[PDB]
């Protein structure tokens, strides 16, 4: 039985149009992950920490028979595959894997949470969210994602 599942993207170091890619190339081959569609990619201004490099975000859908723990070991390895050192929340990285969405299930463990607990106030997750998975509701708000996005200048097509 196929779990649908939605992952963000993001890579600000290097070559990030080519992390972005090997990732969902490397994601696709885990067994038990299949990804079945892929949003336009962004390019993103910081948010947070803004003085480090901008970023390119995207979302993918997947079809998955992994547990919700089981996705975000894979999520991490291929973070490592793409030589992801640094480890500040706050910083840079070559990759970064984000659940954003496990069916429509919640949980809440103190490193894990999904829906991700931060997705709605960022237009860098709900923008290309929005191009693939408009009509999905995200369990938190009750609300679908195309009710939740909103404009932000700071979001622009690459
Ligand atoms: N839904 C989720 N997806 C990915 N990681 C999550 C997560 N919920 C909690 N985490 C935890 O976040 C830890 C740190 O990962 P990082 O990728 O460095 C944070 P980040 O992605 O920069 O911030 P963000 O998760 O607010 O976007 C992971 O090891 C994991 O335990
Ligand atoms: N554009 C873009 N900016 C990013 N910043 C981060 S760190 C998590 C975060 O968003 C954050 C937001 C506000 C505060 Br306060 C702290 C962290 N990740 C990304 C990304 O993927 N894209
Ligand atoms: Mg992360
Ligand atoms: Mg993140």
Redesign the pocket.
């Known amino acids: 039985h196929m779990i649908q599942a939605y992952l963000?993207l993001?890579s600000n170091i290097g070559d990030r149009e080519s992390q972005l890619n090997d990732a969902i190339k490397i994601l696709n081959e885990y067994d038990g992950i299949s990804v079945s569609n892929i949003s336009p990619i962004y390019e993103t201004a910081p948010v947070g920490y803004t003085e480090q490099p901008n970023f390119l975000n995207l979302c993918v859908e997947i079809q998955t028979t992994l547990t919700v723990l089981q996705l975000?070991e894979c999520?991490?390895k291929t973070?490592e595959c793409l030589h992801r050192i640094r480890?500040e929340?706050?910083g840079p990285?070559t990759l970064?894997?984000?659940?954003?969405l496990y069916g429509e299930e919640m949980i809440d463990l103190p490193?894990?949470?999904?829906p991700?607990p931060?997705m709605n106030e960022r237009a860098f997750v709900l923008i290309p969210l929005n191009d693939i998975a408009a009509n999905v509701v995200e369990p938190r708000s009750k609300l679908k994602v195309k009710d939740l996005v909103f404009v932000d200048d700071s979001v622009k097509r690459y």
């Open positions: 963000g993001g975000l999520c991490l973070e480890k929340r706050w990285r970064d894997v984000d659940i954003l490193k894990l949470s999904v991700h931060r």
